[PDB]
């Protein structure tokens, strides 16, 4: 970076170069890459944070529920081949959002919570 040796208790090593805590910054926004995430992105000769990397080079997808696009930086729920906007990952019956460890069934592209599988299938199929 500043091309000067640090002389402190803690320093960083990235892209076969040594850096300060303050010197290893994202080339686009200037955020401290060490405090923000344990990894940096290296594209077109630039050291980039995840956000700027994904906004610029990320791959978008299609939501299995709403059929609208999902931008690369959007939070998602991956289930087998399918991908959902986090807000679309909800039970088709009760419209309830889930918790880690909860049980749901995947029918086609429908997410139906466990409690609801019976009544939903009874009504819909």
């Amino acid at each position: 970076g500043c091309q000067q040796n640090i002389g402190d208790r803690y320093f960083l090593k990235a892209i076969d170069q040594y850096w300060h805590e303050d010197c290893l910054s994202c080339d686009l926004c200037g955020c401290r890459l060490g405090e923000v995430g344990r990894r940096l992105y290296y594209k077109l000769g630039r050291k980039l944070c995840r956000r700027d990397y994904l906004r610029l080079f990320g791959q978008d997808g299609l939501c299995a529920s709403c059929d609208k696009r999902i931008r690369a930086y959007e939070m998602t729920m991956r289930v087998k081949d399918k991908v959902y906007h986090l807000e679309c990952f909800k039970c088709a019956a009760c419209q309830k959002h889930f918790c880690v460890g909860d049980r749901y069934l995947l029918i086609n592209s429908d997410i139906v919570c466990e409690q609801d599988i019976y009544e939903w299938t009874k009504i819909n199929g």
Binding site: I15, G34, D60, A72
Partner: peptide, 29 residues
């Protein structure tokens, strides 16, 4: 066919593995 809810993940986060570089924190004296 009955599944368990996992953690969310970012959309393009699967795709940018090649471009990911690791930051090593080191010690002195």
């Amino acid at each position: 066919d009955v599944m368990v809810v996992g953690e969310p993940t970012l959309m393009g986060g699967e795709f940018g593995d090649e471009d990911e570089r690791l930051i090593t924190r080191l010690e002195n004296t």
